[model samples]
Target: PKEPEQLRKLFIGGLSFETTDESLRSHFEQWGTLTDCVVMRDPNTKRSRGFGFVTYATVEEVDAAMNARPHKVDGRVVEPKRAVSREDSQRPGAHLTVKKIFVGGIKEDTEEHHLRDYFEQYGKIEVIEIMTDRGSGKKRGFAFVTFDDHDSVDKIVIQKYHTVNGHNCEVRKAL
Candidate 1:
């Protein structure tokens, strides 16, 4: 089970405005098993927020997918960021020794309480911030999640990195 965390996932950016989970999944499925996929969208407008994620069952498959479609989709180019492993993503940082986890591609209706409740299964969450603009008070299509310890960070990363909750999820350690 822990070994699955070692499998590679990719943060695909510059996604076409019209792309959807099905289309992205279909494109990558040609390379190998696509564990999951999603295209981020504006919470209010339900419009493409211009990014996505794809998790492959294996690193080899991920590499093949990258090579096969580096930049040939719906007028958008793909930029792949190596998904961080649970071990690595939780590695202690210098800033206050806090573990910062980012959760994106969450549903529009998701709130701070909902985010905390969903993530609390892993560990004690120090802070759960649903990204909302100060000016418009709108969900910003992402959230910053903080865990009190490394183990908690690891647990959540391993358990829910790419699962679907109306949309595929992309999680990572943030600064």
Candidate 2:
């Protein structure tokens, strides 16, 4: 089978903070044929890290679930979709190229404000978007800060690795 695994697998966020697998799986399981569903937590802190990690047998059903809970508002503006750009290309990887700057690894308590407020220090930002899962009306995992014209994005691109409110996000160019 040609693995459409990347599409089938999701980076489901918007966790219940403490909501774990049983109900998570059962609730989410009802939506699709799951390969698995999980919520990660530190045994010491007794709190969940992400909403949950889930997988379905097909990409179509996974997208179908996105429409199931279409009740709440989403994160912010929609920017470049990293999942859509699953086939990334490299072009010497320098100066941030501002290929819409795909910012990844955004996590807990790190809102769009955090991203905008923090990254504005680097350049005159045009737009910033963090996908909020429609299922839970919260952030997915990564974010996008649109800055194609200003090479000023090069400032942070130099750092290569930066942290915002403890979420050490990675930035890359988009096609």
**Which candidate's TM-score is highest?**
1
Q: Model 2, range 9-108, lDDT digits (tens) per residue?
A: 5445565564567756666565688787777787798677744467778865665555455312133121111122122346341222343777788874
TM-score of 1: 0.45
Stretches > 4 Å off in candidate 2: 1-96
Tell me the TM-score of each prediction against the true structure: 0.45, 0.42
Per candidate, the number of residue pairs that clash is 0, 1
- For residues 1-175, write the lDDT of model 1, one tens digit per residue: 3236345677777788888998888777888887778888989999998888888888668657655545556666766554555344445421222378888888677667767767776667888788888899888888888877654554455554454345577887678
Q: On a 0 to 100 scale, what is the lDDT of residue 33 in model 2?
A: 85
Model 1 stretches astray by more than 4 angstroms = 86-175
- Worst lDDT run of 10 residues, candidate 1, spans 89-98
